[PDB]
C-alpha cells in the first residue's frame, strides 16, 4: 500500500517522478526525483526521511 506514493510527483520540486533513490547501507528512501536527490547529496544534506548520511543516489526505473 506504500506504493501509490510512487505515483506522486517528487515531494521537493513537485514536477518530476520519484526516481531518485537515497541509499544508506542496505536501505533506501524513494521520495524525490534523481535531480533533487543529487542536489541534496551535493549540499551535504542527510536523508530527508531518516536523517542518515546519503551514501549513494540512484536513478530508478520501474519494471
Amino acid at each position: 500500500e506504500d506504493c501509490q506514493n510512487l505515483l506522486k510527483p517528487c515531494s521537493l520540486c513537485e514536477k518530476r517522478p520519484r526516481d531518485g533513490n537515497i541509499i544508506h547501507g542496505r536501505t533506501g528512501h524513494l521520495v524525490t526525483c534523481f535531480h533533487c536527490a543529487r542536489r541534496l547529496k551535493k549540499a551535504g544534506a542527510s536523508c530527508p526521511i531518516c536523517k542518515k548520511e546519503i551514501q549513494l543516489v540512484i536513478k530508478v526505473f520501474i519494471a
Binding site: 517522478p17 541509499i23 543516489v57 540512484i58 536513478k59 530508478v60 526505473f61 520501474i62
Partner: protein, 64 residues
C-alpha cells in the same frame, strides 16, 4: 512527472509483495521485485532480468 502504473503492481516474481527490492548496478536501479525475491536473484548470481547487467547490490526501498 510520475512513474509508470507498473509501480503499484506487486513483485513480478512472487506477485505477493511490493516492488521494494531495488536492484543496483552503477548509478541506476531496476525496481521490479520485492526484497526477498531480489535477494534470491543476487544469491543465485543471476543478472538483472531487465537490463542483464550484473547485480552489485539489493537495497530495501521505502516510499513514504
Amino acid at each position: 512527472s510520475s512513474l509508470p502504473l507498473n509501480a503499484i503492481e506487486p513483485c513480478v516474481i512472487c506477485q505477493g509483495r511490493p516492488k521494494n527490492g531495488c536492484i543496483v548496478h552503477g548509478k541506476t536501479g531496476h525496481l521490479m521485485a520485492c526484497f526477498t525475491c531480489a535477494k534470491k536473484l543476487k544469491k543465485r548470481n543471476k543478472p538483472c532480468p531487465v537490463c542483464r547487467q550484473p547485480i552489485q547490490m539489493i537495497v530495501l526501498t521505502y516510499f513514504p
